[model samples]
Target: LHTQVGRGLLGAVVNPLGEVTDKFAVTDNSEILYRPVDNAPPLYSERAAIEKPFLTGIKVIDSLLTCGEGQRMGIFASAGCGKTFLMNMLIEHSGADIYVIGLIGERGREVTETVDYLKNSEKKSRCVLVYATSDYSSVDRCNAAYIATAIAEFFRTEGHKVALFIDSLTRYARALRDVALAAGEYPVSVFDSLPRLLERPGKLKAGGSITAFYTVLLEDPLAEEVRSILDGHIYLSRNLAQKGQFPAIDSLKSISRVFTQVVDEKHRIMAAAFRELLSEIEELRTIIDFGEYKPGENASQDKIYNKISVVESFLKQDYRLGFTYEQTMELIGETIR
Candidate 1:
């Protein structure tokens, strides 16, 4: 059915009778929304910068990176690094009016559990999860991807900040490549031209917002294309996950290109201090590893170790336990020793 002519829809699923009840369905208008492989929507703003921060309430991320509202963000991690799990935590906490989640090329349990998460979440009815998992056809995701983006676009055009999360770009790319070739719209190599195809969906000018969080595996060729264009990148290394950093985000590698634009002075200062402390601790660890520094000659190593302990304590946390932005600043600013 066309909300283009009726009361706005909930991005909900519909039945074959053109009845939208609980889940979600796609519009026939997907063609107009169709952009070329490289045709990202024209991003425009009077000032056109990140003014509002998307508060995740995750200490290291919110205090340091300070993700901008409407900015397309990414999670660059290998498998088992808790990228999607961490993202799910944000979904639970975020105040967005609409959440358009596209589960591409993941497991059946993956999509099912995520939908369950959304169903039980505070966002509840405001959230929509579109799945193209291995349990289903990949072709299905092709339609779901565009529709999910369309739904997010709908929310964005209005005055809402929509969170558009695509679980795996590698799978989404599969859909894109499939649909493109089937329609006889070949644009060079599918792998090479993937970023171009994603351009329009990747960003928006500053009306409302569609802040996106995507999960990308390190070795996947298509997912790699995504990293370069993303303004915010949250890295999660395997080693960090093994060490049991539940979020497993490599704080140094993670970044927000326009963080300073949205971050307040207090947060900015804390971010700076946090970065400096992390750098110093990293160097100290390197010295320890190389055997250049004596282990127990002085209390200096112990002091730094305690500081590292406090820092890691802040950094290493599961999604279930949360810290508000204010609490994060206070903790980071406390006497680390």
Candidate 2:
């Protein structure tokens, strides 16, 4: 538990195009600070709330299941429905000054190259990928997300908007469950204390902000508790992924309380309308699946098919290297069109 290295390996600004701009600047001037991760009740007067946006590079999330500065969101999916793929797209397109990723407890084949793939930035110290994979001890992999969270807050306090991409916390929790069972202890840390631990960085009150996005599975016992504490969540439909949707973010399943901070009244209304439309389309599909596609109560089979087409067309987008905010808004509007 004692220190082995006194120096801090501070990373330097690099390119996001898979280029190593420079070597990390090591500093022996760092110390182990035990400040509470949460409880930073400012000694100063009140400022504005989290009014800034953390654009996710993906238009669907930016326009709908949006994340704000100082918010925690999760991508909930099962069967690996484009979670890492969507995350990788975000790394390429995010305008964040710093991006840190936790490829925790993932397949070695899937994550070995993730670090170099994301650590590229032309000028900004763009990204850091913490590969806390299965090769490490279960204890280490279980704690990797927490360590990554601490590192994210490290830069937030340094006045940078940091986007943290945690591949999936579900695996970490399962590992903790195994640990808990072996000791005859409950899943206390993984279930109880962890929400606060995982969320504190994104909810920090510093000048800088941490916007966290972690992945979860479709079926989770901890989800009800975990989702209650988070600011937002995006649900990736395995069905949609199987059907070849790019992001697979089911609009009806996603929720974002922080969307108002970035999106305007018109966009908000539009997003809502778009959600309703998708919901209707989904209902139609259910009805059709139940062999009730014969006639219309309020809609026809032809119209239902058309709406289904619109839903697919609106959501399926190429992972274009980058797009502006307004361009994203346009795509959201097209959802209802």
Candidate 3:
């Protein structure tokens, strides 16, 4: 690919090989660079610290599970548990200079809808989608993930903050497995190649970053491996969804390793208090479930449960509403305190 490929890629939806998928054409004559799948990541010494938060416009994430720039975080969840909803929220609210979205092993119709949505968004000219739908070959699907990363890397090197959203990295791993099986390799493992892709996200010393939000299913064994390699994760709970939680985030399970470094002490203390309240509510729920105590048997415990109910309801947000980080903190402070 040409070094100028990123320029042509802006505002275009393309296949894994850089062929325009939308009704448009790419034209440029910049020097060609072999955009390989397994590109070397920058040395740790060549990177800078995560200096800012990557707000997703969702209250739960911005308030409790705050992400940092260049932080690679996994959106851990199961099928139909609103993983897509969370990803959409990030795309809508991240406010990055460049957006590189990869639709790997997803439904073709889903990709179509995503393309339409991106086209309608205000950032249409600054974002690009790399799509290799479920109907594509395993090799093609896997290539799409790398291509998306490459696109983000190019723009980041050109001094643009890039947000790369890969929906279901587990799907990419499965595609790798399929590719290995086709080659008659028994007991395949993507553990090696997986980190090569994930490690690509980081703050560059040259003053640009690639903040990645990749999804992985909680039940997948690969999820454990992916979680360990990432900076942290946002856990989407099936039980929370059953309870009608809009975002369905299990704040107790979710974490951001750089939270303390990015947010102030007040935000940190409040988030900790919120977690304590949630933990207390969980214990009270267990006692109630075992029939040892009723809801009104203990006044203090009843109050704790009621407070948690309000906090959970307040955390629930529509994906479309763009809540700034300050606004989220203020609203959470009012309820959690």
Candidate 4:
């Protein structure tokens, strides 16, 4: 028997019968979980790796930095530290064809002479000189660097390695500061500072390297602000010069980041050896820093200093002589020993 009820008025009634007419059954169902879409995997990946080419060609310098193809390197030194001479040498001997982009911020004659020298030198076919002398407005000088960089980028698209040498970045910085000043930017120091412009060096994805050499004038006590931003520093002193030391690169302050990655395997090994020598040199520096190593003609301190100087000179000489990897390694071992 069955009972029926209205849709809105359903109710349960007690069963009076002692035995049930039909059997009952029950079933269980599983749960379905949900996750957020943010946890999904990426659709694509970037290029495997970028190839970097070694261009500096100067074993010691190149070893320190690979200056990968199309990378920009800056050579910084004071007015007379031979920045131009070094630039000339690199342009002539870099092996790869070079397109010189010169921006003269202060000296017109110097730019003229640089151009004339390149014209007369063996590098005539590979160099291009661009100049905006000191007589030009600060705006023009500032524009020159960008113009040159743009031109270099155009040539680099052709798959040629371009070495861009900026004789002095300080001038460019100063020129830029002047423009800012004229535009109502107050307080020269606020805009003229060095730390603000460290990112000026350009880098391109294409294969090429641009090296810039700059100059900085320092007094007895260096400013904390300036020291904070410099990647490397070369200190020139009359005292060191009198003792036959050249380059006078302040090892304590100089730095060359990413130099190793751009150099060859041979240079990589030499760099390792140089690190050990540098450690010993630092110890000697500590001795000299205190009064333990006194200074005099042929004094212990002087002798040790000369010894370091000699090693540096030897490195330069070996590079000039174009010694092979084996020869260079043997010489480095002997010099350090």
The best candidate by lDDT is: 3
Alpha carbon lDDT of residue 230, candidate 4? 41
Candidate 2 Cα lDDT to native: 0.65
User: After superposition on all CA atoms, what RMSD does each candidate show versus the true structure?
Assistant: 5.1, 5.7, 3.2, 27.5
- Superposed by TM-score, candidate 1 places the C-alpha of residue 114 at a distance from the truth, in angstroms, of 1.1
Give the alpha carbon lDDT tens digit for every residue of 210-245 in model 1.
788877777665455477788778888888889876
TM-score of each: 0.81, 0.79, 0.90, 0.63
Candidate 4 lDDT for residue 278: 64
Question: TM-score rank, highest first?
Answer: 3, 1, 2, 4
Query: What lDDT would each prediction earn against the true structure?
Result: 0.66, 0.65, 0.81, 0.48
Predicted candidate 4 versus true structure: per-residue lDDT over 116-140, tens digit per residue: 6754666565554556777888866
TM-score of 2: 0.79
Give the candidate order by descending lDDT. Answer: 3, 1, 2, 4
Query: Residue-pair clashes per candidate, as listed?
Result: 10, 6, 0, 11
Q: Whole-model lDDT, candidate 3?
A: 0.81
